């Protein structure tokens, strides 16, 4: 991977998380993609979706509300994150090279492009997924909470 | 790429139902739910 354009295919925007706030297998589709999280003034850093955490702060994102967190990390600086500070902006050049330098600076291997190509299709298969099992039920239980 | 959107009864929230789905609302749980108006041209004669 040497290009911020291929990196945007697995870039998770803000309009896609709202559909999967209650879809399970969540720790298996989003873990391996990159989000454009906010720090703040218009600077951004490419953080790594590491684990699925939950905050005790329930915040509303438009119509929907979600109190969960995201285990993100920019190379070595890792902390908790909420689902509102993510940007719909794609991976720019300065932020792509900044993430490249944070990964070369941390000792983390850059994930091979074939991994991104095998990871970007997980999203499209998760979108066209027929919800024939008992996911509607847990979804309503999770929405009413 | 249109998913056939319905409106719940008791919720009034648009749901997406594709075929082979249970008709239930994505929230609160409701088995009755209605369809949205058409997109075709409705023209009347004020008559």
């Amino acid at each position: 991977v040497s290009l911020p354009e291929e990196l945007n295919r697995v870039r998770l925007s803000r309009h896609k998380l709202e559909r999967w706030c209650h879809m399970p297998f969540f720790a298996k589709t989003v873990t391996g993609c990159f989000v454009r999280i906010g720090i703040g003034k218009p600077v951004y850093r490419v953080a790594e979706i590491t684990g699925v955490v939950e905050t005790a702060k329930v915040y509303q994102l438009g119509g929907t509300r979600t109190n969960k967190g995201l285990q993100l990390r920019h190379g070595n600086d890792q902390r908790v994150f909420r689902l509102e500070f993510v940007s719909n902006q794609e991976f720019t050049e300065s932020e792509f090279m900044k993430w490249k330098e944070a990964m070369f600076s941390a000792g983390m291997q850059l994930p091979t492009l074939d991994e991104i190509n095998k990871k970007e299709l997980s999203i499209k298969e998760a979108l066209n997924y027929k919800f024939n099992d008992q996911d509607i039920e847990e979804i309503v239980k999770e929405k009413e909470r | 790429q249109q998913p056939m959107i319905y409106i719940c009864g008791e919720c009034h929230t648009e749901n997406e139902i594709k075929s082979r789905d249970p008709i239930r609302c994505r929230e609160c749980g409701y088995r009755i739910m209605y369809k949205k108006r058409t997109k075709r041209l409705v023209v009347f004669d004020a008559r």
Partner: peptide, 17 residues
Amino acid sequence: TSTYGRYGSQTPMYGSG
């Protein structure tokens, strides 16, 4: 109907709170 942002809806920052 996949990502209709058209930018966005004023993305809130982390260092703003």
